[PDB]
Amino acid sequence: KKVLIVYAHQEPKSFNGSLKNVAVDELSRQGCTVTVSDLYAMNLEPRATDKDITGTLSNPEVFNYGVETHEAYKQRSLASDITDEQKKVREADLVIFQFPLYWFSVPAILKGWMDRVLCQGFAFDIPGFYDSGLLQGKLALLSVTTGGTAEMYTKTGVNGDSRYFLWPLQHGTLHFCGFKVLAPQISFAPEIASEEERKGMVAAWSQRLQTIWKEEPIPCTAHWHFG
Amino acid sequence: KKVLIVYAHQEPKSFNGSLKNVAVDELSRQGCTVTVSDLYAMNLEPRATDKDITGTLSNPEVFNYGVETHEAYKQRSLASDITDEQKKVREADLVIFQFPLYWFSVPAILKGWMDRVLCQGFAFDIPGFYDSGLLQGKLALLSVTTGGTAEMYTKTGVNGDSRYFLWPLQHGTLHFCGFKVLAPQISFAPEIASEEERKGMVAAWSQRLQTIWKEEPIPCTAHWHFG
Ligand SMILES: Cc1cc2nc3c(=O)[nH]c(=O)nc-3n(C[C@H](O)[C@H](O)[C@H](O)COP(=O)(O)OP(=O)(O)OC[C@H]3O[C@@H](n4cnc5c(N)ncnc54)[C@H](O)[C@@H]3O)c2cc1C
Ligand SMILES: Cc1cc2nc3c(=O)[nH]c(=O)nc-3n(C[C@H](O)[C@H](O)[C@H](O)COP(=O)(O)OP(=O)(O)OC[C@H]3O[C@@H](n4cnc5c(N)ncnc54)[C@H](O)[C@@H]3O)c2cc1C
Ligand SMILES: C1=C/COCc2cc(ccc2OCCN2CCCC2)Nc2nccc(n2)-c2cccc(c2)COC/1
Ligand SMILES: C1=C/COCc2cc(ccc2OCCN2CCCC2)Nc2nccc(n2)-c2cccc(c2)COC/1
Ligand SMILES: [Zn+2]
Ligand SMILES: [Zn+2]
């Protein structure tokens, strides 16, 4: 089994860093092939621009990012940062995203990974999306950390259910590309937690990874997210 | 009345470009003060990094973006790009976001504007969020374009209701900062639309803007989004 961890945190000593490292440790111990895309260390470009296409654009006068990247994918003329990520995704059986929640979503650097890597022709086609997406047969999992507490992320709490914010990521992105989605790993409020509680949350993640290949996906439906 | 338009499209001749331009024209005609932050033209940095804090002689052993930006805000030592955006927001009565939908969310460059500009001390405090957010008394409005059709973005359509994807943006971001949220402007599927239909969608936005100051905000609730 091949695993790609797309990791989005600036600080190696962070709680996110520890969750990433325990995932490498545990998945490596199992004998999995593991790759980490450390986006901040890579200084990944997040902006969707004409620099993402090498050589001459299909229409140099009016720039249409979607058309140009779709054609570049077909012509093997995407920027090498993009194509390097695509190779990692193509080979992976499981893609784990490890990030702190920023504005009920992914940090911009990770949003940029999604925007630039998951291009038409690679991740989906028309037709060829949702269950027919081009990354069908693969698993994806969101491993998210929050400032807010679990109680705040309940239906009656100030933030609403955590599932509510997952919709654009799980349905709109991962399911759209054909992934099956494993239940999210949400590590609530590490700053509020004691050191030993944080150790427990890292241990919980490690333990979950021991049996990750036996899990069933979640149903990636509006009902799951909002019902 | 002062308006800031935060605009995220690479191509001035785009449908998004036209929506931005009609907004400038209409609001300017009314006598409003209008500013546009053209993120791609500004080459706005989207990544949340230690470069966002100026005047650091020696790097801390552990970098905590949220703590460091909070402190930098209080010390007036944020990067000049951030500071300049904050001044525009501080003065604005209405903030319009004009963007194409990317993965059920904002383009990464706009996500980076949110991540970097809306820092603790400026947009919210702890406590001082949701109805006590620091941008209370201001209005915000999302003007979104999509590839998918209106019918796809219905409860029974493949993408679910358009309101579902608005939650992280409207509740988790804008309401969290204390904004009152005006109903979104969603211009569906301009590529599919005929030239006449496209002109109609631009005219509809301009027409709406004629009376924007008389609108009531939406109730920014789970019921509004998911009911
Ligand atoms: C721009 C921005 C937007 C945000 N938006 C949101 C939002 O929408 N919703 C929300 O809820 N929160 C939000 N937050 C808060 C953010 O999600 C949290 O601050 C983040 O998830 C905390 O994770 P961390 O890895 O940075 O924590 P850290 O601060 O690294 O974790 C706390 C401590 O854990 C320690 N630690 C590291 N490894 C271990 C280990 N193995 N065992 C024990 N301790 C360890 C660290 O040393 C550190 O002292 C936002 C923050 C920012 C900056
Ligand atoms: C990375 C990525 C992710 C995406 N994710 C999603 C998603 O999650 N959901 C989704 O639905 N879509 C998604 N899309 C599609 C994207 O949202 C649409 O392509 C975008 O909204 C179209 O807006 P535009 O301004 O680029 O259109 P354009 O292609 O510029 O507009 C269509 C036509 O309108 C013309 N036009 C411009 N101004 C006028 C005028 N005044 N009058 C008449 N015609 C005019 C233009 O010349 C053009 O021919 C995604 C695209 C990308 C690249
Ligand atoms: C909760 C806010 C409380 O602070 C959490 C918290 C939050 C941040 C940094 C540290 C931190 O707890 C650091 C630890 N602090 C110790 C006591 C209070 C938390 N920063 C931050 N920045 C932008 C948006 C949000 N949070 C944001 C947006 C929406 C919803 C939330 C956060 C989370 O629910 C609302
Ligand atoms: C609809 C897919 C149809 O293509 C729309 C469409 C899509 C794109 C570019 C142009 C475009 O219509 C340009 C005009 N097209 C050319 C022929 C007619 C439609 N690109 C794109 N890229 C990444 C993700 C998504 N869309 C994405 C993710 C989730 C949901 C959707 C899109 C939207 O619902 C699913
Ligand atoms: Zn789904
Ligand atoms: Zn709300």
Curated annotation (Swiss-Prot), chains A, B:
GO terms for molecular function: chloride ion binding; dihydronicotinamide riboside quinone reductase activity; electron transfer activity; FAD binding; melatonin binding; NAD(P)H dehydrogenase (quinone) activity; oxidoreductase activity; oxidoreductase activity, acting on other nitrogenous compounds as donors. Zn(2+) binds at residues 171, 175, 220. Signal peptide: none annotated. FAD binds at residues 9, 15-18, 101-104, 145-148, 153, 191, 198. The modification Phosphoserine is found at residues 77, 194. Keywords: Cytoplasm, FAD, Flavoprotein, Metal-binding, Oxidoreductase, Phosphoprotein, Zinc. The enzyme apparently serves as a quinone reductase in connection with conjugation reactions of hydroquinones involved in detoxification pathways as well as in biosynthetic processes such as the vitamin K-dependent gamma-carboxylation of glutamate residues in prothrombin synthesis. Belongs to the NAD(P)H dehydrogenase (quinone) family. Homodimer. This is Ribosyldihydronicotinamide dehydrogenase [quinone]. The lineage of its organism: Eukaryota, Metazoa, Chordata, Craniata, Vertebrata.
